Amino acid sequence: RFVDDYLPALLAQASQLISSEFHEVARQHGFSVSEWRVMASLAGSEPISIGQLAQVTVTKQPTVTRLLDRMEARGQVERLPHESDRRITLVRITRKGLKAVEHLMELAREHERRVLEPFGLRRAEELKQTLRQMIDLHVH
Amino acid sequence: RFVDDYLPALLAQASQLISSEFHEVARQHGFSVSEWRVMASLAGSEPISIGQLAQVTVTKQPTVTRLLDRMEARGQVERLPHESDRRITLVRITRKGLKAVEHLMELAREHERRVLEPFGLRRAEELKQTLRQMIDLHVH
Numbered sequence: 338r339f340v341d342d343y344l345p346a347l348l349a350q351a352s353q354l355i356s357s358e359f360h361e362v363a364r365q366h367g368f369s370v371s372e373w374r375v376m377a378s379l380a381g382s383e384p385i386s387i388g389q390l391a392q393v394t395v396t397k398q399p400t401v402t403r404l405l406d407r408m409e410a411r412g413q414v415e416r417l418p419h420e421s422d423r424r425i426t427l428v429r430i431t432r433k434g435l436k437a438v439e440h441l442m443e444l445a446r447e448h449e450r451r452v453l454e455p456f457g458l459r460r461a462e463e464l465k466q467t468l469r470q471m472i473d474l475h476v477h
Numbered sequence: 478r479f480v481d482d483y484l485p486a487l488l489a490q491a492s493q494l495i496s497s498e499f500h501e502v503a504r505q506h507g508f509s510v511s512e513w514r515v516m517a518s519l520a521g522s523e524p525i526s527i528g529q530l531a532q533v534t535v536t537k538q539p540t541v542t543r544l545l546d547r548m549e550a551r552g553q554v555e556r557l558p559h560e561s562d563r564r565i566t567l568v569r570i571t572r573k574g575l576k577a578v579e580h581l582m583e584l585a586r587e588h589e590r591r592v593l594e595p596f597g598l599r600r601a602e603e604l605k606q607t608l609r610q611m612i613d614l615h616v617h
């Protein structure tokens with residue numbers, strides 16, 4: 338069976354199954370899943386470009402920009418001009434956004450701890466290191 | 478930075494970056510990405526239920542059923558009644574579908590080999606084993 342060991346299919350199924358478990362949580366706290374991805378990606382970060390935000394949130398850039406339009410209207414994020422290149426817009430979370438997402442982030446950490454507990458610390462750290470190295474080799 | 482080591486974000490970014498590289502290939506061979514997921518998932522498989530196909534292809538079940546409507550019209554797949562429970566429809570690839578996808582599957586294997594080569598055999602097998610165990614623990 339081709340699909341049983343094919344890496345992209347394994348990554349996509351593991352990602353969908355683990356993420357879908359947290360969806361209910363995010364929505365019960367009043368967040369859409371994409372709002373959660375944006376605010377969790379910006380929490381504790383210096384301002385990043387729209388393109389960087391689109392990559393880390395695995396969301397298409399036009400979709401990200403419409404999302405930021407409403408999140409900025411609600412005071413949860415802010416878009417800012419870039420240092421030199423003004424082809425580039427930066428984005429950051431505001432204090433209001435951080436306060437809105439902090440509890441959900443603790444719940445996310447607890448859920449992640451549960452997902453990783455059966456694997457033990459060595460296998461969990463190996464998995465995270467491999468995924469980080471793959472991202473850094475394939476990001477454009 | 479919360480997002481830098483958060484497992485679901487790492488899985489989703491690695492999955493999106495690695496899969497998007499093969500999209501161009503699939504389309505140059507005349508496949509949509511979802512047609513590729515269906516035919517690669519059924520290749521070499523006994524008939525599986527629609528719900529199983531939706532899970533392994535990470536596609537919503539109503540979307541899968543519409544996709545199968547057109548793929549079956551093109552003779553690439555076939556839906557069949559289940560053994561006993563006729564709440565359940567099974568689906569299989571046909572010979573025509575297998576012949577249509579076989580070359581693309583070899584290209585997919587080559588791309589996967591390239592993705593995994595820098596990690597070496599031990600780290601690649603550890604990654605695949607961890608992902609398989611996660612899927613089997615979280616599938617519903």
Ligand SMILES: O=C(O)CCCc1c[nH]c2ccccc12
Binds near residue numbers: 500517
């Ligand atoms: O959408 C993509 O580009 C592929 C995502 C990975 C993926 C998930 N399920 C699958 C079944 C067969 C082949 C690939 C997969």
Ligand SMILES: O=C(O)CCCc1c[nH]c2ccccc12
Binds near residue numbers: 370373375378394490
């Ligand atoms: O869509 C989901 O349910 C989450 C997918 C995983 C994911 C991808 N990018 C992210 C950035 C912040 C938090 C979670 C993520």
